[PDB]
Amino acid sequence: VNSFSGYLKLTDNVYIKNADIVEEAKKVKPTVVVNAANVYLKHGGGVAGALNKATNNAMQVESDDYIATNGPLKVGGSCVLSGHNLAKHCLHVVGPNVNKGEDIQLLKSAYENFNQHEVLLAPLLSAGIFGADPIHSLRVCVDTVRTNVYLAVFDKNLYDKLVSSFL
Ligand SMILES: N#C[C@@]1(c2ccc3c(N)ncnn23)O[C@H](COP(=O)(O)OP(=O)(O)OC[C@H]2O[C@@H](O)[C@H](O)[C@@H]2O)[C@@H](O)[C@H]1O
């Protein structure tokens, strides 16, 4: 459980690896995997779609029940649902959609949700379909999260760019 290997250490508590988050989940057996979600938990073409496909759509069905019962999340908020076959829990976190003009300051609130869990496998929030500057997302993570976060960045071009400017 929580057996993370091959990650580069960025700070005392933040680590990064060039990998698919789904493949990492199957190897590391994490207590918590983080999804980069929207307020409707409608799992689209990035990390959310990859995680969902790996559960054979069970994540989406559970998400449909959560949303019908509780209504949409707020931007910067989160909820904990099952991790199905990938993890004990999935922490669904909503970063701001910068492509739709949502406030970038909400990325700090988004990463604050990680602080409620001792160890997480996670993606870089808002850095794909939501269009935020990935260098900013990584630095906000580093400056906000105090628990142990292992970031899986599937895009090798981006991984190399983040590592080169960070170290
Ligand atoms: N690298 C990388 C990626 C990425 C893509 C696929 C994978 C993978 N299999 N393993 C690891 N990483 N990874 O991880 C980052 C997050 O990008 P992502 O688009 O998921 O999140 P976001 O918060 O921007 O947008 C939320 C909306 O996207 C809908 O999926 C969802 O339902 C919401 O509507 C980007 O750098 C992205 O290139």
Residue numbers in the entry: 3 to 169
Question: Which text from the study accompanies this structure?
Answer:
Schroder et al. discovered that GS-441524, a metabolite of the anti-SARS-CoV-2 drug remdesivir,12−14 binds SARS-CoV-2 Mac1 with an affinity comparable to that of ADPr. Interestingly, they found that the cyano group of GS-441524 similarly occupies the oxyanion subsite by interacting with the backbone NHs of Phe156 and Asp157. Thus, it appears that the oxyanion subsite of SARS-CoV-2 Mac1 is a “hot spot” for binding that is not utilized by ADPr but can be actively incorporated into the inhibitor design. We wanted to explore whether converting GS-441524 into the corresponding NDPr (3) would further increase its binding affinity for SARS-CoV-2 Mac1. To understand how NDPr binds to SARS-CoV-2 Mac1, we solved the X-ray crystal structure of SARS-CoV-2 Mac1 in complex with NDPr using diffraction data to 1.4 Å. As expected, the binding pose of NDPr is well-aligned with that of ADPr, except that the 1″-CN group of NDPr forms hydrogen-bonding interactions with the backbone NHs of Phe156 and Asp157. Compared with the co-crystal structure of SARS-CoV-2 Mac1 with ADPr, the nearby β7-α6 loop moves significantly to allow interactions with the extra cyano group of NDPr, a feature also seen in the binding pose of GS-441524. We were pleased to find that biotin-Ph-ADPr and biotin-NDPr are ∼50- and ∼70-fold, respectively, more potent than biotin-ADPr based on the Kd values, demonstrating the beneficial roles of the 1″-OPh moiety and the 1′-CN group in binding. A good dose–response curve of Ph-NDPr with Hill slope of unity was obtained using TAMRA-Ph-NDPr as the tracer, yielding IC50 of 3.1 nM, which was 6000-, 500-, and 100-fold better than ADPr, Ph-ADPr, and NDPr, respectively, measured under the same assay conditions. Interestingly, this cyano group is detrimental to the binding of human MacroD1 and MacroD2.
